[PDB]
Ligand binder design. Structure first.
Ligand SMILES: Cc1cc2nc3c(=O)[nH]c(=O)nc-3n(C[C@H](O)[C@H](O)[C@H](O)COP(=O)(O)O)c2cc1C
Ligand SMILES: C/C(=C\[N+](=O)[O-])c1ccccc1
Length: 369
């Protein structure tokens, strides 16, 4: 198998095995995708699969300023232009439906409400908050409130709408965001979940919300158009897990029965060391993948974090992974697929222009000659 040869992810056909990781850029004021966003995505349409930046299923799911959503008619129309552009170039695109959970601020929330979480525990984290026009930004995450049983049902319903909205926006599928210490992760990990009901305590109880979200989304748009992103050992957004292995091995066993399109896995700390361990014992990724395969999982296995050209090629040829997702490299190189095939030198990303701003450090990265 080769990194540049076609792949199959559920109902979605990929031209190659190079995937664009989801990357929040904070460049959609009013939570609506615009023309500059369309150009940016169309430049990168040569990717086998494009995973969009995190897109909240509701305002409650929002946690940062200028982030495109799926809860507006205008936002769906904006997304329709982008998926049309990507499809015209022969590319494939999936929406990363998002809910931040406790990682948010009151100003972003409806009615100025508290962010929602499995348990009412405040996080030591930061947020982008726009200041009139503005700008201001940078604030502590707000004090959250604990979710009732009725609240969870309503969030599941918001996930159903988001999945429907994505297909209406012309997306090939969705990627459920269950990584980097957000709402689903908050239920999964011990440090955030101190509930005393069916969603707390045991591994089976902690995994329940994730599976309910998956089942709701798959019922709406089909399992073959549904994927999910996981990050077993990430410390992002004040989250901690004592024993990730038995917890995450259980999750993929359940997912292997679900007929999912793909499983996107962040190996190591997100934007950090790949060998990172929160607990006493290091995570076993080969064991992790096998727990999925043994349960009957046929979904495309997509790996991420710290991959270069050499490492990505070896991983696919060895069959350790089905595909590889690049984040910062796709920011700097719109024509990343062509460069990798040619073994051509790569543009370097500019950290200061990652979040907020305009065309600079966004659509002005040069392609190959
Ligand atoms: C600017 C930036 C924005 C990111 N936004 C998201 C996101 O919206 N959703 C997500 O799951 N991961 C997000 N990440 C993580 C990347 O998708 C990916 O896991 C990794 O950090 C990119 O670096 P890599 O190419 O070495 O894998 C983001 C990373 C960066 C640097
Ligand atoms: C979207 C995301 C992280 N993530 O899910 O990986 C992020 C958004 C704003 C600032 C920093 C990070």
């Amino acid at each position: 198998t080769s990194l540049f040869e076609p792949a199959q992810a559920g109902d979605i056909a990929l031209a190659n095995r190079i995937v664009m990781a989801p990357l929040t850029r904070n460049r959609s004021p009013g939570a609506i995708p615009n023309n500059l966003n369309a150009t940016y995505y169309e430049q990168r349409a040569t990717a086998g699969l494009i995973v969009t930046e995190g897109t909240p299923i509701s305002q409650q799911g929002q946690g940062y300023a200028d982030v495109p959503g799926l809860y507006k008619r205008e936002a769906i129309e904006g997304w329709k232009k982008i998926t049309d552009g990507v499809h015209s170039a022969g590319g494939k695109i999936v929406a990363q439906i998002w809910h931040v959970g406790r990682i948010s601020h009151t100003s972003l929330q409806p009615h100025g409400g508290q962010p929602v979480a499995p348990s009412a525990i405040t996080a030591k984290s930061k947020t982008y908050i726009i200041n009139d026009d503005g700008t201001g930004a940078f604030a502590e995450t707000s004090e959250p409130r604990a979710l009732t049983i009725d609240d969870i049902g309503l969030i599941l319903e918001d996930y159903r709408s988001g999945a429907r909205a994505a297909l209406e926006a012309g997306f090939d599928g969705v990627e459920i965001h269950a990584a980097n210490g957000y709402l689903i992760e908050q239920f999964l990990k011990s440090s955030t979940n101190q509930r005393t009901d069916d969603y707390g305590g045991s591994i089976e109880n902690r995994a329940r919300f994730l599976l309910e979200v998956v089942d709701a989304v798959a019922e709406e748009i089909g399992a073959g158009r549904t994927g999910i992103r996981l990050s077993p050992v990430t410390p992002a957004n004040d989250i901690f897990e004592a024993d990730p292995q038995p917890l995450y091995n259980y999750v993929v066993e359940q997912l292997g029965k679900r007929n999912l399109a793909f499983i996107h896995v962040v190996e190591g700390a997100t934007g950090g060391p790949r060998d990172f361990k929160q607990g006493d014992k290091p995570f076993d990724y080969a064991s992790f993948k096998a727990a999925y395969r043994n349960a009957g999982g046929k979904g495309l296995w997509i790996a991420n974090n710290g991959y270069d050209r050499q490492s990505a090629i070896e991983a696919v040829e060895s069959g350790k992974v089905d595909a590889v997702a690049f984040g910062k490299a796709f920011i700097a190189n719109p024509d990343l697929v062509r460069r990798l095939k040619n073994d051509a030198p790569l543009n370097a990303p500019n950290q200061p222009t990652f979040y907020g701003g305009g065309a600079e450090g966004y659509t002005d990265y040069p392609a190959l000659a």
